[PDB]
Amino acid sequence: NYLPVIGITMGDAAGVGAEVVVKSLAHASVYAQCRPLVIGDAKRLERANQIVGGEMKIRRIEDASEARYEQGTIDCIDLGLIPDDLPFGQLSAIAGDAAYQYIKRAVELAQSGKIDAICTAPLNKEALHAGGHKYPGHTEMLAHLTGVDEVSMMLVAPQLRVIHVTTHIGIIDAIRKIEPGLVQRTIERGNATLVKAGIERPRIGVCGINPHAGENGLFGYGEEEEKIIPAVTLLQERGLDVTGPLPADTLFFRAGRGDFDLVVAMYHDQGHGPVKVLGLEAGVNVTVGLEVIRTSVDHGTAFDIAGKGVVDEGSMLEALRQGAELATRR
Amino acid sequence: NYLPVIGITMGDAAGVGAEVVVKSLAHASVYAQCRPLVIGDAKRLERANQIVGGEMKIRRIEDASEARYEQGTIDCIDLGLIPDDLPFGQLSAIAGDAAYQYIKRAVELAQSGKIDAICTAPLNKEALHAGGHKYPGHTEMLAHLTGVDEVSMMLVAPQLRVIHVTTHIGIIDAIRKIEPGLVQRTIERGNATLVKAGIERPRIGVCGINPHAGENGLFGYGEEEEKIIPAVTLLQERGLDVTGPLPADTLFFRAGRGDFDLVVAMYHDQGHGPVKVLGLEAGVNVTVGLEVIRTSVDHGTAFDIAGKGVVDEGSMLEALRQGAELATRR
């Protein structure tokens, strides 16, 4: 029905972002899923088109309303920041600043409702810093500019959406970090994102910390009752459809069967293993809790191959697809 | 190829074991996979056959060599322990002892090389104790009679075999329990069982404790280096094909692709979630470290339905199939 507008940020101009965007938008499949709007540098996209041997024309626009989404011609909100001769594959404070400016513009468009999702091409933290934007990372920058303190990481597969209470932390520290506030906010973020994506009443299942969710006290130190159950109870009383804590393995079986719209995993491997085992296109991370859904790829600026036309666009295509499926419905 | 002999133990005569055994062996598919030998009570199997409306005849035999494996006629190593009138659905000291005696006989047969796998029908712990056999459970009794201090639990799916260093224990205590001796033995058990099943040099992948296996010390308290790596190195030096610790999720991806014959999971949910998400026939547990592979079903003696002919044999069929696949090759 509605084809969502996806704001695609070009990332660091010295890295593979421009090339991967231009290769991605040569696929007709993209235009079955979304209306792809590039925020970036029009000249850099033209250079990338030459580098990849593409047939893409670039249309310089100022406002999202000017975009036509005609295959063969990329609509680029052109900030004009990148010198024509900026080298590929080397650190650039100018490219770092421009990567920030593309992200800032994306956040602005998301706030005004002019895009329905963000898909971020890679940037380089060192260049970002040199360019005057000393953020801890790409995701942290999006969150700060959006005005939110926390986001959650989600993985998506067929029948499976898995949002994480904790991710990149040691397992012992993970268990310490989980408590009802963070669990509650993780569930809320997942619920809100699925409502935006057109599921009016998301069916949410929540994993235990212990196997079998503790088996009525048989396993563990009461982590379910201390850390999880108070959040679940509060959100049930608010009217959300939340079940758990459940044995994580049983919940994944049921989710795969179609019983749940969302699985809330407590820690990294609990949620990541069941998605990764399926062997699907790797490298896409979903960020939950900004004004619109955001996706990205995990491959980096790849300076060793930047400007050589060899970067593979498969991960980006999947990031766009996942972004389109979770985009805000209008 | 060789059809392995599976020693099927009848379990507790008051429970659903006899019924599920008689229902299972009515399936022609079993006979394409194995030669099914029942250790139990011939009169009880006859009574079960009447109950389930079957057409099975029972042949009383003394020695495994007598078994004919003719469809329609179950070869039963008949210990003659169960009175004809023993009620279904009630605890019995005689039934509890007989369940122990069937297991004991299966262990003897495995030791002499007269069966290639064991598949156990359910028994009842309270009845076992009532018959003078004070074991913590079914699996513990098998281990004790076999002469081993430890076994490991394994789950099997297409392209995935996942053996666990720890299972039913809280997550904090699991990480404490893991140390290099236990890791080493888990890997050894897994390797030996796959060699028995005809994989000369098993390719083994080992999971980390921390996500990303610690990411070079970024996550966690050095658990990989303390608890896992000394075991992996020792076994590599001894000539086993062992890779890890690896990020668990990456390892599951690779295993699903065919890169490993065995995945060594550190704790319950790490290994169980990726198997269960696949949504395949549930209920089957594989015990590794006895003289031959052993499988079993989760469902218990089910005294509430014992003797009524309603017990479903799906789980037991899958337990037989998995047992046949992992049976000792001759």
Ligand SMILES: [Ca+2]
């Ligand atoms: Ca975290």
Ligand SMILES: [Ca+2]
């Ligand atoms: Ca254990």
Ligand SMILES: [Mg+2]
């Ligand atoms: Mg190509």
Ligand SMILES: [Mg+2]
């Ligand atoms: Mg039937």
Ligand SMILES: [Zn+2]
């Ligand atoms: Zn990760």
Ligand SMILES: [Zn+2]
């Ligand atoms: Zn379990």
